[PDB]
Amino acid sequence: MFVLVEMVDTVRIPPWQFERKLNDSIAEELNKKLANKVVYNVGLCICLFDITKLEDAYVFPGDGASHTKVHFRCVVFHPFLDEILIGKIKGCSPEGVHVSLGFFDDILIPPESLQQPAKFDEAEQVWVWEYETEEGAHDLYMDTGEEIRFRVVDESFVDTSPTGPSSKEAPYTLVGSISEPGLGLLSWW
Amino acid sequence: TQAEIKLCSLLLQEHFGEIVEKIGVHLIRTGSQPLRVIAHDTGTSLDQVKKALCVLVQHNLVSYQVHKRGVVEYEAQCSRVLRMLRYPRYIYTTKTLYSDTGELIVEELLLNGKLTMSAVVKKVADRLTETMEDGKTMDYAEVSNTFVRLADTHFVQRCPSVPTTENSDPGPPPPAPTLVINEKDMYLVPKLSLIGKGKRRRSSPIPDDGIYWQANLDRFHQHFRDQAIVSAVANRMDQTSSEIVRTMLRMSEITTSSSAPFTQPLSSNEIFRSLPVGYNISKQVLDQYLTLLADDPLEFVGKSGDSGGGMYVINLHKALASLATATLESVVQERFGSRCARIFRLVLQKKHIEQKQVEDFAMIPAKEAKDMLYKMLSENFMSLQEIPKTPDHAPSRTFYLYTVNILSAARMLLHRCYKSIANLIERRQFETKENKRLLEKSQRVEAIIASMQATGAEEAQLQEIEEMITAPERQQLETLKRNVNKLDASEIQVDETIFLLESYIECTMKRQ
Amino acid sequence: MEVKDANSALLSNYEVFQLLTDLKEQRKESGKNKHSSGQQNLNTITYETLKYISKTPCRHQSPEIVREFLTALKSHKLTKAEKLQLLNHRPVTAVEIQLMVEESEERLTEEQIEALLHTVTSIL
Amino acid sequence: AAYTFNIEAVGFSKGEKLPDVVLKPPPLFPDTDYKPVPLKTGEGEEYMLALKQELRETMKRMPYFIETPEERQDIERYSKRYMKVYKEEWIPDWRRLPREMMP
Amino acid sequence: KRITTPYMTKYERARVLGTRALQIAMCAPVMVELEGETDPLLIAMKELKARKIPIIIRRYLPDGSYEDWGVDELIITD
Amino acid sequence: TEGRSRDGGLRLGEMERDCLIGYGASMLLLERLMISSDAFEVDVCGQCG
Amino acid sequence: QGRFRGNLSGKRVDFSGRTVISPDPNLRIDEVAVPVHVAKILTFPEKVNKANINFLRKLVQNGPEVHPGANFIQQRHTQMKRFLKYGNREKMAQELKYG
Amino acid sequence: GVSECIIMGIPMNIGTGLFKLLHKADRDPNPPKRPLIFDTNEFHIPLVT
RNA sequence: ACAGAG
DNA sequence: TCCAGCTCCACTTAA
DNA sequence: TTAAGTGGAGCTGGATGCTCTGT
Ligand SMILES: [Zn+2]
């Protein structure tokens, strides 16, 4: 479900690390700058996948470190629209249902895309669903959060960059839907 | 011309879009260029440049010529881009002289840029079906009958023709065919025996091929020039006197240059038969009018002859100088008030004048006149002569004669107009873009009514439209429309000022 | 840092399983130094991704299992985004094919859908 | 305190009534005594108002309005044929147009 | 083939010793067996005489082409 | 600062600059005339310059 | 005395000194005698590494007033400087790190 | 040029500035790539005609 | 601004 | 205290 | 006869060494 992103960078290798093969030292110094961070237009970087090319290791004047331009590919969790995923409920809230996908927690099920039978919680945090035959409106998305299946209808990037001179909002947002048949808790289908 | 290029950028974006306004503005700003560097200076791909250039040449907005070594150079026609703004006034004035068929002819010619005579009579017939009902078709005969009347009156004219390759230079194909204008056949229509009917949108080899036709924009300016002169005479003298002027100008139409100081003289003996039969005036009283017009110091008419009875000419250049001055004085009056407009007409008649004579002559005191004088310098309505006593040019020993120059103040005022329209468009587009949220929302509710209008459409959908939360919002959309309708209407009305000022500037230039 | 291709390839979750397992074989032979939080970011994202994938049915697969899965599914007129989803989630009921494949009730006949159920569960 | 220039060369022969010191800058949009002339109305000046708005809505739909091409669509799907933006294409007259502009 | 002179110029010698001294001042591995020297530039001069310096000199021709010469394969001289 | 009273320091003039160029001493001329006088950092916008 | 000649092409520099010169033939031609009063002021930043750690410790212990000594000490990723006249120098010598 | 390099604080081209130094690291350029398993061309002939 | 020193 | 450009003005050729 | 291109003469603006050492 992931993608590769082809990226370039100039990596500074300091001179105490000259006792190590360069392809090992470069990869470590790249994971330290990319892992668990969102790169704006492309998504959340998991780790470096491989180095595809490695240019000349210049030494610039006034420093002793070596600078080398690296060509590399990185595994990034970018899910395409209308994809099916499975994940666990962390919380119920008035604004909707919040889903976790392992590492990723900013998954929104909006109430405009929830199941139609029940749509306004009666002063309760937990969301509800009513079926006439079974369960009299007490069926619920439990706080323990047994895995739901959801379909990612929308995603948005918000540019979390400094405004004004210098001297926490979620930068990657994902919006699901659950209204289709076959979506929901796994035990329902 | 930074105001012109800013205004041309908006017009091309609204009528043609983003990847062609880039090429259009670049041609206006840099002048003529070969094709390869138009792409490179812009970063557009070569296929998009060809698409952009071919649409700008279709609507007659760029010319092309062959040069040394056979390269084509394109060249933008800046003034012809600005005349896209006057298009509704053209479509209205054809509806005044001609029926609704003549309105739809000019609309198709202006929107497609060039059309063949077979193509226009087709598309006018197709569109006039919506104006009629109960079986009656539009037929191609009554379309052409107005087109050939448009042609004789010179509102529509043939485009520059491709040359005959077989007669001239047979052989290797040229990079561009080096088009030329023929003076004989501009107003000579092809004869068409084919007739037919317009299709009512049910949805369930060509003889005049290459005879393209386009609107003759210079003929509309000769119409609008007449209306400015005729209406000025209607105010100052009388409606009867205005008709005498309208009679002279309508005869002048076919036999005079669109740029000349004087038209062909006409005798009062031949004016008499040309005036409509309802004007219960004797020939002797007709000569009373003509002398009292010629006595006027505004000199809209003059004598210029004595043969065949009384001979009279109407002055084209001197009427425009009056109208440009009346335009120039009217903006002074509204911006700074009547007492300042007094001083503007004072200095204009007392061609060079000093402060102590201004307060004496206008009966405006000091500390009120001088404040008005010094503002008119700083808005470039008025000038200083500064005759020196000595080659020091020192301020203590020179007499600061004021002057009004009409030509420079007309060029200055025209520059204010181009930026004024650009601002009005910028306000409309800002309020349209920042309400795309509500405009989509008000579309989608109306889309539920438009889509599935009749087939299977139950009555159970007519109340669910106002059930959305857009019903309180509606107050904003009434504010939107009243804003846009005032901004659009002001964008039309400032064009009345441009045409008066530009026609004066156009005639004083000899372009030698 | 500059990006030369945003979307380059689609990855199965088996390749990420194989990547992080090969990563784990050579990680944690040196600990975090706390000269910078950079090592903390790498550990938390690697661990939580694999703990997610280890609860997905992508385990026990292999390169020759995945390659032959495409070979069997080659003849079925499915796009990449549909073949990818059938691999990663292991469908066993009929309903999620209408989710994972658009207009499946129009493109695939009921016998073709039930052949697709068997093609998944016999190979995977 | 005196300046570099002599103030008597500018003016101020009496020795008083120097202009005051501006404390706060003047506002960006100062108030004006005069107002715009109200617009012209009529049955003819309003028909030009409606024809002007119909030329925007038409010339955006006509084939001369070359829209910018889209790019970097992520994946292919079966909703591509259902969502193909169909529009007919205009063709020029390549006699008048130069040879250098064929697509 | 490489057309430029095989001798190390005084400017190449000055900057190799400088860049190596700055690298030995930071905690880089020393390739020679040092013998109680403390001054980084003196250690770099032993590495030059022993031909152990890991620097490549990229000679630049004015058209933009280049030649990569090893410090160990230039002819050093006083 | 300018001199002994103010613990001023010494000048690398336009003539001493001409000497160091003739040695080809590019880094020493950078150390003397930037690093040990007036080294600074500015924020430069790459868009407007 | 303008920018381009007075402050840009040439400029006042620190770590500089001036004194009267006098002969000494017992020095080699590549040597110059520097007085102790200038040598105690003109400092050189020696970066701590494996070859000089035990040498610089003795210099830190002597401190500012004895000639083979040191005036300042600066920590690895810090840009403030500890003036070594105060504090106990035998503690600051023990806490030398590489870098 | 030399004079504007001293003004702007960048090392002059002449002298020791004419050449660049590369570090002789033990590196393998164009290293062995990880094969993709899924998104290879032979299994993904286009759907549309 | 002047005097010095090399 | 010494020295290149810029502009004004007479001075022949040419139609 | 005069339009014009080029000579000769006067006006204008620029420049004139490097540092410390004191009042
Ligand atoms: Zn900026």
Coordinates of C-alpha atoms in Angstrom, one line a residue, chain C:
Chain C
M1 CA 16.4 18.0 -0.3
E2 CA 14.5 17.8 -3.6
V3 CA 12.0 15.3 -5.0
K4 CA 12.5 13.9 -8.6
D5 CA 9.5 11.6 -8.7
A6 CA 6.6 11.6 -6.2
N7 CA 4.7 8.4 -7.2
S8 CA 7.2 6.0 -8.7
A9 CA 6.0 2.5 -7.8
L10 CA 3.2 0.7 -5.9
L11 CA 4.5 -1.5 -3.1
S12 CA 2.9 -4.7 -1.7
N13 CA 3.0 -5.0 2.0
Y14 CA 5.2 -8.1 1.6
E15 CA 8.1 -6.0 0.4
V16 CA 7.9 -3.8 3.5
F17 CA 7.7 -7.0 5.6
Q18 CA 10.8 -8.2 3.9
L19 CA 12.5 -4.8 4.2
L20 CA 12.0 -4.3 7.9
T21 CA 12.8 -7.9 8.8
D22 CA 16.1 -7.5 6.9
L23 CA 16.4 -4.2 8.7
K24 CA 15.9 -5.8 12.1
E25 CA 18.7 -8.4 11.4
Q26 CA 21.2 -5.5 11.5
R27 CA 19.5 -2.9 13.7
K28 CA 19.9 -2.6 17.5
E29 CA 23.5 -3.8 17.4
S30 CA 24.2 -0.2 18.4
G31 CA 21.8 1.6 20.8
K32 CA 20.6 5.2 20.7
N33 CA 23.1 7.8 21.8
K34 CA 20.8 10.8 22.7
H35 CA 23.1 13.2 20.9
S36 CA 19.9 13.8 18.9
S37 CA 16.3 12.5 18.8
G38 CA 17.0 11.2 15.3
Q39 CA 17.5 7.6 16.4
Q40 CA 14.3 7.7 18.4
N41 CA 12.3 8.6 15.3
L42 CA 13.7 5.7 13.3
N43 CA 13.0 3.1 16.0
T44 CA 9.4 4.0 16.7
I45 CA 8.4 4.2 13.0
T46 CA 10.1 0.9 12.1
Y47 CA 8.6 -1.1 15.1
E48 CA 5.0 0.2 14.8
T49 CA 4.9 -0.4 11.1
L50 CA 6.0 -4.0 11.4
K51 CA 3.7 -4.7 14.4
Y52 CA 0.9 -3.5 12.1
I53 CA 2.0 -5.6 9.1
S54 CA 2.5 -8.7 11.3
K55 CA -1.3 -8.7 12.0
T56 CA -2.1 -8.4 8.3
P57 CA -2.3 -11.7 6.2
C58 CA 0.9 -10.7 4.3
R59 CA 3.0 -13.0 6.4
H60 CA 4.3 -16.4 5.2
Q61 CA 4.4 -15.1 1.6
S62 CA 7.5 -15.2 -0.5
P63 CA 8.8 -13.8 -3.9
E64 CA 7.7 -16.8 -5.9
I65 CA 4.2 -16.8 -4.2
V66 CA 3.6 -13.2 -5.2
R67 CA 5.0 -13.5 -8.7
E68 CA 2.8 -16.6 -9.4
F69 CA -0.2 -14.7 -7.9
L70 CA 0.1 -12.0 -10.6
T71 CA 0.5 -14.8 -13.2
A72 CA -2.8 -16.5 -12.2
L73 CA -4.6 -13.1 -11.9
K74 CA -3.1 -11.9 -15.3
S75 CA -6.0 -13.1 -17.3
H76 CA -8.8 -11.4 -15.3
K77 CA -8.8 -7.8 -16.6
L78 CA -7.9 -6.0 -13.4
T79 CA -6.0 -2.7 -12.9
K80 CA -2.9 -2.4 -10.7
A81 CA -4.9 -0.8 -7.9
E82 CA -7.3 -3.7 -7.8
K83 CA -4.7 -6.5 -8.0
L84 CA -2.7 -4.8 -5.2
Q85 CA -5.7 -4.7 -2.9
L86 CA -6.6 -8.4 -3.5
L87 CA -3.0 -9.2 -2.5
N88 CA -2.8 -7.1 0.7
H89 CA -6.1 -8.0 2.3
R90 CA -6.8 -11.7 1.4
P91 CA -10.5 -11.5 0.7
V92 CA -12.6 -14.6 1.6
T93 CA -16.1 -13.2 1.3
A94 CA -17.9 -12.0 -1.8
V95 CA -18.9 -8.5 -0.5
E96 CA -15.5 -6.7 -0.4
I97 CA -14.9 -7.4 -4.1
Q98 CA -17.6 -4.9 -4.8
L99 CA -15.5 -2.6 -2.5
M100 CA -12.1 -3.4 -3.9
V101 CA -13.2 -3.6 -7.5
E102 CA -15.4 -0.8 -9.0
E103 CA -18.6 -1.9 -10.7
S104 CA -17.7 -5.6 -10.0
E105 CA -21.4 -6.5 -10.5
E106 CA -21.2 -5.2 -14.0
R107 CA -17.6 -6.2 -15.0
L108 CA -17.5 -9.6 -13.5
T109 CA -20.2 -12.3 -13.8
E110 CA -21.2 -14.2 -10.6
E111 CA -19.2 -17.2 -11.6
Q112 CA -16.2 -15.0 -12.4
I113 CA -16.5 -13.4 -8.9
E114 CA -16.6 -16.9 -7.3
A115 CA -13.6 -17.9 -9.4
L116 CA -11.8 -14.8 -8.0
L117 CA -12.6 -16.0 -4.4
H118 CA -11.0 -19.4 -5.1
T119 CA -8.0 -17.8 -7.0
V120 CA -7.2 -15.7 -3.9
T121 CA -7.7 -18.4 -1.2
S122 CA -5.9 -21.2 -3.0
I123 CA -2.7 -19.3 -3.8
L124 CA -2.4 -16.9 -0.9

